[PDB]
Amino acid sequence: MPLAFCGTENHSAAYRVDQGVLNNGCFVDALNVVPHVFLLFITFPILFIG
Amino acid sequence: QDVFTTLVDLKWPHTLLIFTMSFLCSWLLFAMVWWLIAFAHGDLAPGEGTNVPCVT
Amino acid sequence: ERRARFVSKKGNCNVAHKNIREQGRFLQDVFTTLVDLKWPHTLLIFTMSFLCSWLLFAMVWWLIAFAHGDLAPGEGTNVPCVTSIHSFSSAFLFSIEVQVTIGFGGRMVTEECPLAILILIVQNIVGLMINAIMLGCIFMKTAQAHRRAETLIFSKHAVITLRHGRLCFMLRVGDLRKSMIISATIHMQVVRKTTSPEGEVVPLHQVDIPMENGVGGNSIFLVAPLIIYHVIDSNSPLYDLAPSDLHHHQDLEIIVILEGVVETTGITTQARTSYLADEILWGQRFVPIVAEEDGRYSVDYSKFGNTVKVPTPLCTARQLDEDRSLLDALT
Numbered sequence: 001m002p003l004a005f006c007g008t009e010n011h012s013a014a015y016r017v018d019q020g021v022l023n024n025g026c027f028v029d030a031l032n033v034v035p036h037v038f039l040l041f042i043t044f045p046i047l048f049i050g
Numbered sequence: 051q052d053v054f055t056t057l058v059d060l061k062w063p064h065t066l067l068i069f070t071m072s073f074l075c076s077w078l079l080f081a082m083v084w085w086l087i088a089f090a091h092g093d094l095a096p097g098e099g100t101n102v103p104c105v106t
Numbered sequence: 107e108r109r110a111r112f113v114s115k116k117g118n119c120n121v122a123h124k125n126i127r128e129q130g131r132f133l134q135d136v137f138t139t140l141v142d143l144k145w146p147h148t149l150l151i152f153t154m155s156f157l158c159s160w161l162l163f164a165m166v167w168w169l170i171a172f173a174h175g176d177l178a179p180g181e182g183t184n185v186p187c188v189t190s191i192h193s194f195s196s197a198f199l200f201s202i203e204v205q206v207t208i209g210f211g212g213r214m215v216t217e218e219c220p221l222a223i224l225i226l227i228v229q230n231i232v233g234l235m236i237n238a239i240m241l242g243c244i245f246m247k248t249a250q251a252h253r254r255a256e257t258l259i260f261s262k263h264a265v266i267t268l269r270h271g272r273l274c275f276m277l278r279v280g281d282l283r284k285s286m287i288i289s290a291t292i293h294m295q296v297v298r299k300t301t302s303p304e305g306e307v308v309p310l311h312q313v314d315i316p317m318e319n320g321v322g323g324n325s326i327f328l329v330a331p332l333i334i335y336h337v338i339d340s341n342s343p344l345y346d347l348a349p350s351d352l353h354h355h356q357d358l359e360i361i362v363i364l365e366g367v368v369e370t371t372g373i374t375t376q377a378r379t380s381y382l383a384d385e386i387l388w389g390q391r392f393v394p395i396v397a398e399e400d401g402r403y404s405v406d407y408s409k410f411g412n413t414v415k416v417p418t419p420l421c422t423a424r425q426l427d428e429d430r431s432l433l434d435a436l437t
């Protein structure tokens with residue numbers, strides 16, 4: 001029972017990208033993690049210098 | 051403005067931390083990019099199917 | 107138009123060259139040109155150099171595979187010279203792996219054909235050479251200290267006031283960083299269209315000017331702001347500047363050259379500034395700046411360039427020294 005970003009239940013089938021990837025309710029959440037991890041890792045080197 | 055000159059003035063402990071943070075931030079950011087592109091490609095759900103993974 | 111400045115207040119000059127017989131020296135200094143370029147342009151050339159090299163050798167790897175005929179489907183009757191090359195894009199990825207030295211190893215180089223072995227040698231050597239060259243250019247760019255010259259700060263405009271009897275052209279220069287500037291030096295030049303009795307005409311004659319130092323040298327130890335002045339002796343070309351003659355179209359300019367090796371990177375930097383004719387305030391001493399706090403000093407950069415008015419004769423230096431000498435002789 002390891003960690004899964006999407007849902008492990010129902011034999012971990014929330015990863016299929018049929019019927020468009022924007023319809024994969026988990027995938028849009030991953031698209032919403034990109035901007036945050038972008039700013040963390042583009043400003044930590046900036047801030048730590050100061 | 052002169053980040054390079056600023057980095058030189060930093061102590062070695064803080065320079066090592068910034069050295070570490072710079073590499074770690076680049077490594078982890080592109081890890082998300084590789085993970086997301088594979089996940090969008092659909093080659094992340096395992097199975098004996100017609101799909102051929104972009105990143106094995 | 108109104109009045110061309112030799113060097114702008116920010117330190118950049120304004121001289122425009124023309125009719126240069128281009129000998130290709132601009133192109134010849136490839137490494138120096140790269141250093142001068144801006145970081146966005148440097149990164150573009152950095153990216154294009156690597157991408158062109160990667161794509162050039164990628165075409166070669168595809169070409170040798172196509173010539174060997176190992177990319178068409180085969181069933182045991184062949185051994186490809188570069189394994190798993192069944193598309194041009196495979197050759198492109200293989201080129202990336204070699205020159206960057208990633209070496210995934212899914213597309214190996216076999217022992218079969220010798221031509222791929224020579225090309226592997228060439229690509230490795232070219233990759234190392236380009237990596238070494240880009241290192242050199244990046245090391246020289248990261249060692250740049252022209253952005254340090256920006257932290258050097260001069261007064262908005264300079265003054266000419268009496269100090270210790272005589273008259274001197276004063277000035278203030280400050281440093282904002284906590285770091286030190288080793289072996290600093292403050293040159294000073296007057297730029298005037300100076301005509302000569304013999305018949306010569308000079309469009310912009312640059313006359314050097316002493317710094318009125320204690321020991322008559324150019325060395326300056328700059329930590330706090332300093333009132334760096336110039337004693338207007340008999341020989342100084344400022345000996346005949348009438349205060350009434352300070353208006354706009356007065357052909358004058360005071361160059362200042364603050365040099366000194368930066369301690370951090372070890373690179374020498376210049377600071378430049380020009381005081382125009384109308385950018386001089388006659389007879390206004392500088393505001394005292396270096397205050398004292400509990401156990402430590404305090405510089406008030408808010409009052410860096412403020413000048414208060416101090417009484418003084420509105421006479422040329424020649425009309426002052428001569429008058430004082432006559433009065434002493436009469437007495």
Ligand SMILES: CCCCCCCCCCCCCCCCCC(=O)OC[C@H](COP(=O)(O)OC[C@H](N)C(=O)O)OC(=O)CCCCCCCCCCCCCCCCC
Binds near residue numbers: 075
């Ligand atoms: C914080 C990011 C800001 C920039 C975001 C993207 C902007 C793209 C710019 C492209 C050019 C188009 C507009 C030009 C804007 C210029 C910005 C700029 O110069 O500031 C960058 C800064 C400071 O420099 P400055 O003092 O302002 O430069 C002189 C200025 N022109 C002047 O007025 O005199 O320079 C510095 O002081 C150093 C900044 C380095 C930033 C590096 C961040 C860490 C990255 C590590 C992770 C890599 C992520 C990779 C993602 C890849 C995804 C595919």
Ligand SMILES: CCCCCCCCCCCCCCCCCC(=O)OC[C@H](COP(=O)(O)OC[C@H](N)C(=O)O)OC(=O)CCCCCCCCCCCCCCCCC
Binds near residue numbers: 070
């Ligand atoms: C008054 C201080 C206020 C507080 C500000 C700083 C805070 C520091 C806390 C004080 C304790 C620090 C102990 C650190 C011990 C490990 C680091 C280490 O060994 O480097 C210590 C030394 C440098 O020491 P210094 O006295 O600062 O240097 C003298 C000089 N005048 C200067 O300051 O400059 O280093 C050298 O002399 C250079 C040797 C480099 C070799 C290191 C190789 C491996 C480094 C580690 C990398 C791996 C990191 C792993 C991270 C994993 C993250 C997931």
Ligand SMILES: CCCCCCCCCCCCCCCCCC(=O)OC[C@H](COP(=O)(O)OC[C@H](N)C(=O)O)OC(=O)CCCCCCCCCCCCCCCCC
Binds near residue numbers: 143144
């Ligand atoms: C090689 C990249 C390949 C593609 C990957 C893209 C992902 C980029 C993220 C990772 C980049 C790595 C970060 C390294 C940090 C280094 C910091 C650094 O070099 O200084 C930050 C730079 C410096 O700007 P500046 O002060 O104006 O330049 C010097 C001055 N102007 C001079 O003449 O000394 O400030 C900047 O410049 C901002 C740095 C951000 C880099 C983004 C590069 C794209 C530029 C696109 C520009 C297009 C238009 C260009 C027009 C320019 C017109 C003048």
Ligand SMILES: Nc1ncnc2c1ncn2[C@@H]1O[C@H](COP(=O)(O)OP(=O)(O)OP(=O)(O)O)[C@@H](O)[C@H]1O
Binds near residue numbers: 126127128
């Ligand atoms: N417009 C110019 N642009 C660049 N360099 C110049 C220019 N004019 C002269 N020089 C350089 O000045 C030197 C000689 O200058 P001068 O004009 O007195 O002689 P010259 O007849 O041009 O010389 P030469 O026959 O050596 O080219 C040479 O080093 C020449 O390259």
Ligand SMILES: *[C@@H]1O[C@H](CO)[C@@H](O[C@@H]2O[C@H](CO)[C@@H](O)[C@H](O)[C@H]2NC(C)=O)[C@H](O)[C@H]1NC(C)=O
Binds near residue numbers: 010011013
């Ligand atoms: C869950 O995945 C299954 C396919 O693996 C689909 O529905 C399942 O069907 C089987 C039939 O034996 C049972 O496990 C359940 O009836 C369903 N599982 C559920 C509901 O978790 C379907 O693709 C997925 N379920 C949904 C609601 O989409």
Ligand SMILES: [K+]
Binds near residue numbers: 207208209
């Ligand atoms: K390797």
